[PDB]
Amino acid sequence: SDIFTYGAENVPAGGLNLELLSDKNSLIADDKPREYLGQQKTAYTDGQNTTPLQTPTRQALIAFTETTVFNQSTLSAFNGSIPSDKLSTTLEQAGYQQTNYLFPRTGEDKVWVAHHGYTDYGTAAQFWRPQKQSNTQLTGKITLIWDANYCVVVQTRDAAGLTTSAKY
């Protein structure tokens, strides 16, 4: 997702519509000053690998989601106040990672993203229920123990071994 800003003087009489916008010289045409708002990616698994798949499987098991948090121009926000090497280091420690644009253009570098919403799924023999969950890689995973019929979760366990359970 990007954004353009134009002045009042750029609104063609009659307003915008598809025929005008699809034009090669339109306000959304290429070679325009698009500002970047952010991008997202869905990472899929097969319930066996930790390495994400190139394409999803039939079950659409989502491994995690990727979101851009900082562009090179937004890291400028820190107004220095941190060494530049310290900053990239800090961001790595914080769980941010540098990658490319999903829908790249000529003329841009890597951006920092967060990975989150991690789910480890069980197998097909089981109804394909999530077995373990985490907001991210900075913390531990909550174990989900499914009942005999994989209908409800019977017992949950936190990363610390702290455990709750329920009868239904």
Partner: protein, 242 residues
Amino acid sequence: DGFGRLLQAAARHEAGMARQRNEDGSLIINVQHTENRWAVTGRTEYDNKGQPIRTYQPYFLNDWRYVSNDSARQEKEAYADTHVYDPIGREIKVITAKGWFRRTLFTPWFTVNEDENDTAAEVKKNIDPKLYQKTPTVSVYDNRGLIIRNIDFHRTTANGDPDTRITRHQYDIHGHLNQSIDPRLYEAKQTNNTIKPNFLWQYDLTGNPLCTESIDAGRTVTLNDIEGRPLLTVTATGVIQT
């Protein structure tokens, strides 16, 4: 009600004075002592859409059973506010038990909010109400639906010529608040361009402020890790906290 909305609720209290529920559910204003006493609260009539239209003040009742609405609407002392809504579902006017009211005018670019003093002159049949004539609070929007100006009107006497006091706001490309200016400083800025906004903000792409700067409190910078919990921050005084 049959739409699942709360009409009212009541709690049991200790013996004391209460309004009385008659045999047919009629409300009797003249209170008597009773052992069985409940406090009625949250009593509301609706317009069949679910926009509360008549909302009542709490009272004690010598019953737990619901009071009839044909009765409550006629007692007058069974105080309530009246809420008048437009076709959009927004409140237009709210009339309280005192006869005083609030009123809001909506236009495509701004909202004019009149309080009970602004309207005091219209409920005439204390503070000389002339003072609040034409002094509503006006919220002015941009074309993204964000508020960019707040216009107040200022008089210190009923017969004065009201000033205009405008607080300005600007939003960035994600609609986050980028900066704000106190009207005192604003006018000063127009004379001396080296003047900063009262506040400035810098955000990451998820809308977390990373930085803020204030003419009253200096500049701070914060880095949170991906779970949102803070990892590193600096105070205006340069204290680094991790």
